Amino acid sequence: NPKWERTNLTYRIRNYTPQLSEAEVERAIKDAFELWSVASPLIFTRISQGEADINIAFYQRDHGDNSPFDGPNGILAHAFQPGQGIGGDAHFDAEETWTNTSANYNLFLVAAHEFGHSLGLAHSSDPGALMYPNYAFRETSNYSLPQDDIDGIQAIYG
Ligand SMILES: O=C1N=C(O)NC(=O)[C@@]1(c1ccccc1)N1CCC(CCO)CC1
Ligand SMILES: [Ca+2]
Ligand SMILES: [Ca+2]
Ligand SMILES: [Zn+2]
Ligand SMILES: [Zn+2]
């Protein structure tokens, strides 16, 4: 069970996607981290300089980590289990259409799912859980962590 030994973690947005404004990308990420924060003792702090626990970036095909992206559709992003260096980091496929609406693909939703991986959660078998191994849009306004996911982080961090 790889998990963070610390509760205050830092994250850093290394690059942005041209598809949305910087503020939009930052808002999506912030909201995505908040989902998890309200159900655990984890506190996330955004940094702009230096080394952060969770590095977030948009990359194309080969990007230096044994898991190149596949272009439009297919895998949308990937994250690393809690750990030093690359651990906890999340990479988003730069070739995907990134949105903040119902159109594929909503960044807030994909990001929330990736952060679950970054936190140590595995995939869930419950089709209504954020951690279910498939992307499906759900109303983002006032969206909150589903029941199963709350049980998930809870089981790890309390
Ligand atoms: O389950 C996933 N888990 C990821 O970490 N990354 C993905 O892209 C993932 C994902 C799921 C949900 C949200 C974000 C990402 N997913 C997207 C849909 C795809 C379906 C191929 O038909 C299977 C891999
Ligand atoms: Ca892809
Ligand atoms: Ca890291
Ligand atoms: Zn990667
Ligand atoms: Zn996943």
Curated annotation (Swiss-Prot):
Glycans are attached at N8, N100, N142. The active site is at E114. Zn(2+) 1 binds at H63, D65, H78, H91. Neutrophils. It is found in: Cytoplasmic granule; Secreted, Extracellular space, Extracellular matrix. Ca(2+) 1 binds at D53, G85, G87, D89. Zn(2+) 2 binds at H113, H117, H123. Ca(2+) 2 binds at D70, G71, N73, I75, D93, E96. The conserved cysteine present in the cysteine-switch motif binds the catalytic zinc ion, thus inhibiting the enzyme. The dissociation of the cysteine from the zinc ion upon the activation-peptide release activates the enzyme. Belongs to the peptidase M10A family. Can degrade fibrillar type I, II, and III collagens. This is Neutrophil collagenase. The chain holds residues 105 to 262 of 467 of the full protein.
